[PDB]
Paper text:
The T=3 icosahedral calicivirus capsid is composed of 180 copies of VP1 with a molecular weight of ~58 kDa, which is divided into the N-terminus (N), the shell (S) and the C-terminal protruding (P) domain (1–5). The S domain forms a shell around the viral RNA genome, while the P domains form protrusions emanating from the shell comprising A/B and C/C dimers. The P domain is further subdivided into P1 and P2 subdomains, with the latter containing the binding sites for cellular receptors and neutralizing antibodies. At conditions found in the gut (i.e., low pH with high metal ion and bile salt concentrations), the P domain rotates and drops onto the shell with intra P domain changes that enhance receptor interactions while blocking antibody binding.
Once the sequence of the purified mutant virus had been verified to contain the V339I mutation, the structures of V339I apo, V339I + 2 mM CaCl2, and V339I + 10 mM GCDCA were determined from that same sample. The most striking finding was that, unlike the apo wt virus in PBS, apo V339I was in the activated state with the P domain rotated and lying on the surface of the shell. As evidence that this is truly V339I without activating ligands, the inset in Fig. 4A shows the absence of density where GCDCA would be located. The density of the outermost loops (mauve arrow) is disordered, and for these regions, the unsharpened reconstructions were used to better place the main chain atoms. Therefore, this mutation-driven activation process is a simple answer as to how V339I can allosterically block neutralization with all three antibodies. In the apo wt structure, the environment of V339 is markedly hydrophobic and tightly packed. There is simply not enough space in this cavity to accommodate the extra methyl group of Ile that would clash with I337, F307, and F355. We propose that the mutation causes a shift up in the C’ and D’ strands that results in the upward movement of the C’D’ loop. Therefore, this overcrowding mutation is sufficient to push the conformation of the C’D’ loop into the “up” position, leading to the cascade of other conformational changes that activate the virus. The overall CC for the V339I apo P domains of the A and C subunits are 0.69 and 0.67, respectively.
Author numbering:
A (entry chain C): 27 to 530
B (entry chain B): 15 to 530
C (entry chain A): 18 to 532
Write the structure that this text describes.
């Protein structure tokens, strides 16, 4: 334990008068150093001084045992003990500084000159034993609330003096560092409350479903494969299948997978002595509601591709030659306009080459897709020719990383090509529903996933799932590569955005 | 002391697992004054402002009979004293009185809920996980409980509400009676409280009457000397009737207890069934004289379609309304005159009327083509023919914002109506046309001007005769602005209009009223 | 008799001592003491100037200060190396009255968490208070205790503490026939009390709160117009011009929030970057359509602004020069002149809010050009008017509010520039006014200033002599006001320097300017 210019901090002695209870923790927990989340770093000889190696806030989330225990309590108090472990031999050089930042220091960028003005310790990369530090509870309140995130003391480690070493011709040398912690003797909980299952210290989990038994987020068809291809555009701007990890739906994505590529509208039929019968649809919500224009490109579930598709609705005939018929229309979304389709304004048109008088009843219909002709993976004309609010394009990606896609095949009417079409998505609808319902709390930037075989257990690849809702693989090949669709995705831990993945 | 004690008496079994909590000793070095409370206040238990509740056989386990937030609002003395301070701190003592008949059986649980616990769905499983006490409904002596200031600050703020310990009572076992005769008893429980030794206030401030706690009060006026909120006439009767529709959707006379007005109800009683407009006239060889009214706000402001189905004070009933219009002509011989017009606002007939632009059309049969000038007019009602108690058309088959229908009520609960009569045009009948409202315009003005703060869900009121000083019945005034009472008879019931309504206490929606 | 009750007793405020570092020590990391001689001197507060006028009415608030390190320049300077503070202070008040003036004021100690509505003359005396006469010759002092529910305060936020509020108890009256323009000046000073210290020693950060606002040391001649790419020529006021224009460019907040469509650099004004497409089929003419993007290359998405950054906000006809490449060989990239309409005009739908622009150029042959990115900058203006153009077809777009809300007798200070216009009969030059010039929209959003009050008092001086030209109020919205009751426009020399004095409230009265 190093000497730092700081006073002792009182824990339960300050909180006892105004606390209903003071609860004790298992004494076996005070004897083990456990790995802290986001408490690891690697120093390379190509780093410049001033990089923040780690930044961790005091609280129950540092220890998994305390994070589990906090679900049955109302408050907490006390200090912690922290250990830093460095992996370097006797032929290295470089220095590191670990400082104690007070709870209310402003957030921003620090400088190596400024980091030494805090109570701090300076450590050489040749140190043998782990470095022990205290983490004290500097506060203006008597105790903290477990279900609320407040400001506490921070531990910040920054590179101070650059690493100087020799390296072999195959692999480059790095200095690894890890941080562990445990509660100090002065640490307590406050009030015994019934346990809560949805707490802020809850880890993200994924449904146990094979991708072959999932649904596609852009076209209503089962998923037929997952793959990766650097030749396709690396920054697509799809409006469907976008969802945040915390449970925020981005763009025009609906909760249910049946709303995909379909729209609900009220249809007015006008027979013209020229082209023929024309149906004009005024759009409404799929579940049934008034469409209020806002910051969305189109009503939820609207298709987000450019092409020629047909729709079928339920029609009632007023005259007496029949009583109920099912017809088929044709909607044009090609780069020709000439009909002024404005989904944002809440109106669209379609027509058929049908003779005679076929006036019908305007009583609201649901239009489902039938097929596509000349499909293009480009967003449609949400307005006349002008700009509309829409979700940002997928990205950014680190160098050497490429998006992983779930591909599926739709129908065709086109004559030229005869093999197949292909539409891709970033996540199946099951994941969208899972994230929307669970409403997790994101920690830093992204999650480390793991695709493993169901029965053999062999690891296939490791990827990164960003909070914006895309998966990136570290692939440095040339041609497209597909993967088996029988594995299960597993969550490992939270990782920083600048994290290097293992190559395929 | 008492007659046969085949009951529980003292429930001295608590041993509540909680530590003593420091009160005003921690806040003394942080205040700039020395304050204290009258020592005599510390010496007797007084009824809480929300200290009445009922347990009935129709209740089910898991229902919340009451919940109390720690603070000055549990004591009338402390609630009155809090108007001249910022800051309070300390513990309190509570006495629960529930001593039902010896033929009854049941169990309740009272728990200490700490601050920051989420509010809403509390189940019978979780309530026993808190420090709690088990009570039989037959207990003879009062049950004494502590309420402690568990907190992470030095003191609280009297204005605006913070997080404090709660006292929640849940029905653990359904109430049943062993008596053979025809009925099941109802338990009437009471709450009393007094501050503990180390309770204090912090800093003396000017005494402002309109504070958060206060207490709701009603104007001291007999119902017969009040004006109706749906027709410009004095209130003539106080009635209850189960034969009439039970969930009306009246637009006028609707107000919230906290002050907010709902619908098209105006502040003044002269705006009822009257409207101001810009009036233009035309003559056509068909229908004759056609008058068009562009409706505007009666204070001169323009009418903009918003969250209201119509301008304030618009007639919400249906039928044919005959009104009077003052007109000025340019013809030589006379200058000013008053004409009588008729309008049809009943069922939709062959007419082109759209309240979206605020246009109202009146037709008159005439032989001579009168020439007039478009101007400004205000129309008040004169007669009603073919009256119907239903809302008129506002957008010709399209939904418009409206106040929700009055309700809901407990089983056996029926709405109380204030009844007035109008001048009616009749052909071969003689029955006087009658209309009903929920609250008179005096109460609407009182609520809109005072802007009270509601506490739980409703207010308990008692109607007392002034001539003899006799309480006639008790009723529940809901926060949405309607009064309900328990009645099971078939025929209509009438009450004298010489009484005075009095506020008793705050009650929840599950409170059971006595039969009338 | 037995006891004597004096009729004249000196005023005093009774208090109960409040603990400072004694309460905060067990939970604070450190307790740092300050220089022992800072406790010995009253120093003017950063917000320490106010005025009383006969126009004021009883019940009006003259000032209200909050306890903390922002009342003393030494404490405000020292707070840049600490994260917290605790303790009490003392405040001094001086009034520059006369013998012809009658009036009374009350200074009260309002505690934290008292509702911030409106106080009356009856309620103000229910607080601990001191009653002061405007004819007093000596300063009046009061204490300021740290009444709180926490252990200490955080420097970097305002939080809630004890207030010091002063209101006009009795109307100000002068026995003179009047009305004249007599104004009573009031000044505030403060110092720490025996119990006051800081909490945690941190590196000195210069860009913190309680850092006093400064201005660049640049004469108005050496600045740039914020509404036209030309140097600022004149500085003037004019009461015959509209009081509250709706300019969209050249607007900035004191705290650094860019309001409207104003860019950071001065090279973006009245210029735009867009992807161009040219067409000419039978009778439409050589029409170029532009899909707008940001000048730095980023994509444009409709948001809370009515146009991209730097878009013109004046109505007229614009003539611009665009770098265009022609596909025909033997003639490489040139500059083409294009005429475009800014205001409403039929046969077209100008909607810059939606990223669509239409321009036309006279032609008699093919003159074909290739598509791509282009940047258009102004060349000439015809039919200039100071009205916002048609940002949409028939819809309302978000806009900055009109300037307002000047006190009676206050006009708007304007920076005047002359543009390049095309005329046929009138030979008069075209003039355009701005509220704040360029490098004044900059220097904000670069310094994250905290306003701490309602207005800034500035003094305009001469660099070589020091003669005071005028005093003015810089409101937080980013504009200046001057007290002037004349009819004709009045200009000022443009070779001066703007100097900050202090922070003043809304009701501060400026000395009238004139000759």
């Amino acid at each position: 334990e190093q000497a730092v210019p700081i006073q002792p901090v009182a824990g339960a002695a300050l909180a006892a008068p105004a606390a209903g209870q003071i609860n004790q923790i298992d004494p076996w927990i005070f004897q083990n150093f456990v790995q802290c989340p986001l408490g690891e770093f690697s120093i390379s000889p190509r780093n410049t001084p001033g990089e923040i190696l780690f930044d961790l806030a005091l609280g129950p989330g540092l220890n998994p045992y305390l994070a589990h225990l906090s679900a049955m309590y109302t408050g907490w108090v006390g200090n912690m003990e922290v250990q830093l472990v460095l992996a370097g031999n006797a032929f290295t050089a470089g220095k590191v500084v670990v400082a104690l930042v007070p709870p209310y220091f402003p957030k921003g960028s620090l400088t190596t000159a400024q980091i030494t003005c805090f109570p701090h310790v300076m450590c050489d990369v040749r140190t043998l034993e782990p470095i022990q530090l205290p983490l004290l509870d500097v506060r203006r309140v008597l105790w903290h609330a477990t279900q609320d995130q407040e400001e506490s003391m921070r531990l910040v480690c920054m590179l101070y003096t650059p690493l100087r070493t020799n390296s072999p011709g195959d692999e480059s040398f790095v200095v690894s560092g890890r941080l562990l912690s445990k509660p100090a003797a002065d640490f307590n909980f406050v009030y015994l409350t019934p346990p809560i299952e949805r707490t802020i210290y809850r880890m993200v989990d994924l449904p146990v479903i094979q991708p072959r038994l999932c649904t596609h987020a852009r076209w209503p068809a089962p998923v037929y494969g997952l793959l990766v291809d650097p030749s396709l555009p690396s920054n697509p701007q799809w409006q469907n299948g976008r969802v945040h990890v915390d449970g925020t739906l981005l763009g025009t994505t609906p909760i249910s997978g049946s709303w995909v590529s379909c729209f609900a509208a009220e249809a007015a039929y006008e027979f013209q002595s020229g082209t023929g019968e024309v149906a004009t649809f005024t759009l409404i919500e799929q579940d049934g509601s008034a469409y209020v224009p806002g910051d969305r490109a189109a009503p939820l579930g609207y298709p987000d591709f450019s092409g020629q598709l047909e729709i079928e609705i339920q029609t009632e005939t007023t005259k007496t030659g029949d009583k109920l018929k099912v017809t088929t229309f044709e909607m044009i979304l090609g780069p020709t306009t000439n009909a002024d389709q404005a989904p944002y304004q809440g109106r669209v048109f379609a027509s058929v080459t049908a003779a005679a008088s076929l006036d019908l009843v305007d009583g609201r219909v649901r239009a489902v897709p039938r097929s596509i002709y000349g499909f293009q993976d480009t967003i449609p004309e949400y307005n006349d020719g002008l700009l509309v609010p829409l979700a940002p394009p997928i990205g950014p990606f680190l160098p050497g990383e490429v998006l992983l896609r779930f591909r599926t095949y739709m129908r065709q009417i086109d004559t030229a090509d005869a093999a197949a079409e292909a539409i891709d998505c970033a996540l199946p609808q099951e994941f969208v529903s899972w994230f929307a319902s669970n409403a997790f709390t994101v920690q830093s930037e992204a999650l480390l996933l793991r695709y493993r075989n169901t029965l053999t257990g062999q690891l296939l690849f490791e990827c990164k799932l960003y909070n914006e809702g895309y998966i990136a693989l570290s692939y440095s090949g040339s041609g497209p590569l597909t993967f088996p669709t029988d594995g299960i995705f597993e969550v490992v831990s939270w990782v920083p955005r600048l994290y290097q993945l293992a190559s395929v």
